[PDB]
Amino acid sequence: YEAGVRPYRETYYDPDYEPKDTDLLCAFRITPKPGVPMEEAAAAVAAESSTGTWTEVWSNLLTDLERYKARCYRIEGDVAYIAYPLDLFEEGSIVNIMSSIVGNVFGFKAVQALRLEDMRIPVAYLKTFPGPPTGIQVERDRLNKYGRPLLGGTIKPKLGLSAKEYARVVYECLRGGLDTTKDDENLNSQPFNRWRDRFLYVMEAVRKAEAETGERKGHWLNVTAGSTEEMLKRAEFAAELGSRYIMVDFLTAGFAAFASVRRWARENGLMLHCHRAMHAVFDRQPNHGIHFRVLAKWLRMVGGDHVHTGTVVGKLEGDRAETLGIADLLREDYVPADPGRGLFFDQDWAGLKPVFPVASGGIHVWHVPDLVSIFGDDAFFLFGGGTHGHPRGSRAGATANRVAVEAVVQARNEGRDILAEGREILEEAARSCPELREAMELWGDVKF
Amino acid sequence: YEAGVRPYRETYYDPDYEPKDTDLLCAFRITPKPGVPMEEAAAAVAAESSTGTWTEVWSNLLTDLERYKARCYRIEGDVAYIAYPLDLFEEGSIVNIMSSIVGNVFGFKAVQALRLEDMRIPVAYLKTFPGPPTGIQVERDRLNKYGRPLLGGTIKPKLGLSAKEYARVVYECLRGGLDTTKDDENLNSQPFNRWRDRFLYVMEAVRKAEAETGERKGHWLNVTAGSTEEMLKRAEFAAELGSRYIMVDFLTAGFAAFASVRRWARENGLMLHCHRAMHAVFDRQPNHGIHFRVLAKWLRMVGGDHVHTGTVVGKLEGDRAETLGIADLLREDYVPADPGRGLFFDQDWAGLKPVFPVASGGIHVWHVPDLVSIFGDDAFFLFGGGTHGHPRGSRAGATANRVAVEAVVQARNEGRDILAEGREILEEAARSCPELREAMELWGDVKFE
Ligand SMILES: O=C(O)[C@@](O)(COP(=O)(O)O)[C@H](O)[C@H](O)COP(=O)(O)O
Ligand SMILES: O=C(O)[C@@](O)(COP(=O)(O)O)[C@H](O)[C@H](O)COP(=O)(O)O
Ligand SMILES: [Mg+2]
Ligand SMILES: [Mg+2]
């Protein structure tokens, strides 16, 4: 034992280290404090997210730190690659992953900015997670909906509607052609719209639209609440009412409570829509935070049946190439690394079920060719304002959106160039769909 | 009903609005996309965090939007003030506050960066929250410790120690003078150290150190786990073993599970240490995120008995003036606005109990004058590496740290200027304490900016 401060890089930078298949790997984009070399900043991150602290401690000799320490094993420009032994992590706990990987290292004086870009979850650790409770293919079977994107939409105004008027809007949307509708992420239980009232009114409207259309419907009833116990109480009521779905804001509720609801959802046979509210607080800026592709991996591990991925073309920010990579991470059995999409690692998904991407936010009929081109069939497209903002209201808007999606799907199946002919495809459909004609006219001037 | 897209500012910018005492107020620092005026960007934030969306909807006429909409009511440079009616929020739910205020508005194309600086929680909403399960004054009575900062320290190395060796370090620290010790935030249950074993070994060491010193001791047993059910299972065992404390990483576990643990702690009579792991992921940068003072307010509302606040002088970033304001938000009954410290609003705490600030991270004996100057008596100072890194180990390090704090507190109560006379106060104590002498000698040239 030699007391005293040593540079972090002495113990935690090891560019000769060869990662094991069981290691968890991180790619961090590092902005060192001016004067601090990349090697020392990267080693600081490795040390303070695994075993080390700021000075040598006598108790380091009471264990084999060579067995347990994280190691920065590669630095490419400002990207540091760090390997973490499998033994460092609690089985089945995303919460533990976060507590190590993003716990303290984003606040060090020596590292002025830090962004977690990607993470390689090893198969041996992935096997301790349950994954989605339903999965894309089982969900399609429960809905009896194949060969096309699924249609949804958030009820608007976000807040302020009574339970009765809220369910009226739900009914009009489902009756007009949407497969699903959803509570806004911030609609939980409030004086103007209490959750028990909303759940009862809405399921009546869902049943009525299902009977009248002859198609299966769902509403994503938001069980997000102030405590885990309260969330599970709201889920139980949704199950009692025969809802196919519940919805959780998995980041604002938090991963521990999210895990509790996932367990409940699987055991009670309901599908779990996951809203990513708060994600942009820390995934927006390229110099600091956690890229969404990491959150998407953690989501698939805990188990959501859908998660929002962005639209690329709508009102909220989202890079096209990054979104294509995120879609693959959610849906495929194995995703090879791709620097063009910010996928720093190969990701084997170890047989876990796939997750539906959900494209929502500021989209309307003119975006449908782009969205089908981006996502293919296995996605939800959500039209909130793009449904209720139709000149003739929600039911007509739902018809316009549903017809537009089916027209573009048909064109793709016929081998047409759905981007090169997108407007022509929509105009053909509009000739026998007045609602689509009226939607195209209203929003023809609205781009982001 | 007029269909089509309107500017957000038409409905959601109201510079003549006078906030009500029941309103929830937010101060956002807004960086608009180039070409987007501040009024439109601020109105977009107000709209998309309350009632609006990107195009006019027929259902807007099915309610009274004027009664429920949020309104940007003042702009000062790049800071927009937004008022939210009380009816918009679910009683007792921080989760609901976040889902509205920070739910989607940080990801809009029209607003390239956004930072929530402060939030005025109105009294009528605050009354629906329970606050800390113990509180500073009740906690001091439970510990029978008065008139000084309390001493703690994280066990090191962070991970890798067996339960037996882990508790050996705990015992040496508590025996040497620390009031408490704690699990690292990332020590939960792992192959080298399972939580049931750790809880048993550690509580034996706590009881042994309490019997040999004659002073009450505690260890912050981390119950942070993958699910709410598992966290409550670990808390139960901590209570069965007679621990005074449990610990939760309230942000990585999340606020819904945090509230579940707070309720458990109050009902089972255990004190709740709250670690802010992950906070810097979104409170570090000045252009985008949520300032920690907002997280501190939410923490006191749900109810933690301590929360980390930073050290200012240690290894992790923290601004001195902002930290002074955060300490006041955690401890005082009422906190007036203070632009010089980033407190944009008066905050009435409506009778809620206060929270212990906790200063931890890279600090050693030379930082003690600054730490007592910044925080006063009602705080914990934690020395992890600053204890176990002593030339003669944890027991000697704990004595050095305890002696330094009591000397600086002594000199302060002696009318001395502990900042100007800091080096001399420590050296006077170093003459009668060789442990302190060796600590000061070892870390003399270890400085953080
Ligand atoms: O609150 C909203 O804005 C929405 O209901 C969209 O409403 P519109 O359909 O009326 O735009 C969705 O929650 C966002 O799209 C979520 O963003 P993301 O999908 O990027 O998480
Ligand atoms: O993991 C660590 O670094 C610590 O155990 C400090 O160890 P040392 O005492 O050896 O530095 C604490 O968790 C940090 O202080 C937390 O940061 P904050 O208090 O700013 O949340
Ligand atoms: Mg929404
Ligand atoms: Mg720690």
Numbering used by the authors:
A (entry chain A): 6 to 453
B (entry chain B): 6 to 454
The authors write:
Here we use the evolution of a new essential subunit in the protein complex of the CO2-fixing enzyme Rubisco to understand the genetic and structural mechanisms that have maintained this interactions’ essentiality for over 2 billion years of evolution. Modern-day Form I Rubiscos assemble into a complex of eight catalytic large subunits (LSUs) and eight non-catalytic, accessory small subunits (SSUs, L8S8 complex). Even though more ancestral forms of Rubisco exist and are functional without the SSU, all known Form I Rubiscos are strictly dependent on a SSU for solubility and activity.
The three substitutions (R269W, E271R, and L273N, abbreviated as REL) are localized in proximity to Rubisco’s dimer-dimer interface. Indeed, instead of forming an octamer, the AncL+7-based triple mutant AncL+7 REL was dimeric in the absence of AncSSU, as determined by mass photometry (MP). Even a single substitution (E271R) was sufficient to abolish octamer formation and led to ~60% reduced activity under assay conditions, whereas activity in presence of AncSSU was unchanged. A strong enough active site binder or very high concentrations of the protein can thus force AncL+7 REL into octamers, even though its native substrate RuBP cannot. In addition, we also noticed that AncL+7 REL (as well as all other constructs that form dimers instead of octamers without AncSSU) were drastically destabilized towards thermal denaturation (~30 °C), which was partially recovered by AncSSU addition.
